[PDB]
């Protein structure tokens, strides 16, 4: 349940006994009769063989188990691409900034919102109100099943 | 906007100071001239070589037609790219005051219904093509109406 697809050609038809199908995948990358050993659960290998055929099984599973790992990478990159999806025109904005840097630390609407901004209630709050009602119920449900 | 008596401020369809698509920089004033009074002087000139009062309630809605030849412009259509006509009343002002027809205009001014071979080269014009043959006719309104 690993070497499987070294022989994508040998195995078809849904599901297949474990043990046996392993001989089918193993033969398809030479894996010489004297060098691998089958018990119930464990496989055993001689010096030199296991491992260059595990390595070369990375080379020959390619076909589906590389195309397995591929689907994974897919599924993940969807979520994880981030880092360079950005800088372009903002880097050119650094240049807007820089031609004006002489006049940058030199800025109009800087700090006058936030020192008397611990002392106040009514905050984000209308954005909150609707979505606070939604938040109230949800927070209950999630605590419950934990 | 300045010589705007309340009554025709309603009748001649006046949105107010700054509440305009493209009277940019709000009201910028002018040195040694006062837009207020200048309304009357430039209302007076059209009479001499001879424009009637139908033509001049129309040249009052040629303020609405140069405000709306700030608006007969196929504002670059961000999504499809081939842009289209914002206001019917504006085209309505325009083609009647160019002696043709208002529907027949805008049709063509979006879709050139031309004809090479079999192929009735019926298609959209782009903003550049269509808001050119309709800037080339918002301002061949401003030009072939000059």
């Amino acid at each position: 349940q690993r070497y499987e697809i070294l022989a994508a050609n040998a195995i078809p038809k849904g599901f297949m006994d474990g043990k046996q199908a392993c001989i089918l995948m193993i033969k398809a990358l030479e894996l010489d009769p004297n060098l691998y050993r089958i018990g119930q659960s464990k496989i055993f290998f001689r010096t030199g063989v296991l491992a260059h055929l595990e390595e070369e099984r990375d080379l020959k599973i390619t076909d589906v188990i590389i195309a397995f790992q591929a689907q994974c990478r897919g599924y993940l990159a969807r979520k994880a691409f981030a880092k360079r999806q950005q800088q372009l025109t903002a880097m050119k904005v650094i240049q807007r900034n820089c031609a004006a840097y002489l006049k940058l630390r030199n800025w109009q609407w800087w700090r006058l919102f936030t020192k008397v901004k611990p002392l106040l209630q009514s905050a984000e709050r209308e954005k909150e109100m609707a979505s606070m009602k939604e938040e109230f119920t949800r927070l209950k449900e999630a605590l419950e099943k934990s | 906007i300045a010589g705007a008596s309340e009554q025709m401020r309603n009748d001649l369809l006046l949105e107010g100071f700054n509440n305009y698509t493209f009277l940019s920089n709000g009201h910028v004033p002018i040195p040694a001239q006062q837009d207020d009074e200048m309304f009357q002087e430039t209302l007076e000139a059209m009479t001499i070589m001879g424009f009637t009062e139908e033509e001049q309630t129309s040249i009052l809605r040629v303020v609405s037609s140069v405000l709306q030849l700030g608006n007969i412009v196929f504002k670059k259509e961000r999504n499809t790219d081939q842009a289209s006509m914002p206001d019917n009343t504006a085209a309505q002002k325009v083609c009647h005051l160019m002696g043709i027809n208002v529907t027949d205009f805008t049709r063509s001014i979006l879709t050139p219904r031309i004809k090479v071979g079999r192929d009735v080269v019926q298609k959209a014009q782009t903003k550049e093509q269509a808001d050119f043959a309709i800037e080339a006719l918002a301002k061949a309104k401003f030009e072939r109406l000059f």
Partner: protein, 148 residues
Amino acid sequence: FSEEQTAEFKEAFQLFDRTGDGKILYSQCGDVMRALGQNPTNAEVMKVLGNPKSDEMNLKTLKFEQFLPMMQTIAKNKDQGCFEDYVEGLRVFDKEGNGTVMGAEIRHVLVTLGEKMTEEEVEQLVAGHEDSNGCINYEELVRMVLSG
């Protein structure tokens, strides 16, 4: 591809730049492609990139009519799997034969085989699809990988 989806691709290109001139790093090719309805193996991409090692893989640049042809040159595709292929290909940790899969081992294959996943990549695909003993129902782990 239609101009519509290609415009979305034009953006998924445009975003990912370096010096500000229509230039995407080789590295980013497959990942952008992956989001664009594709799962192209590193081996598949490496073919259509021309076998870089890590150095010029990190250093060499794409541009849009190198990227968009690449996208296409994998996208119209050969073998790409379905449920039946992937239940066998994910019965792939059955330990006895059990209809449920090996917890450490699903992590290990992902480190040990072809397209060596980091620890990070391994854990994310697997986590919380096992039970108390760490048996994963693959019959479902399959559909999870195959749609999402």
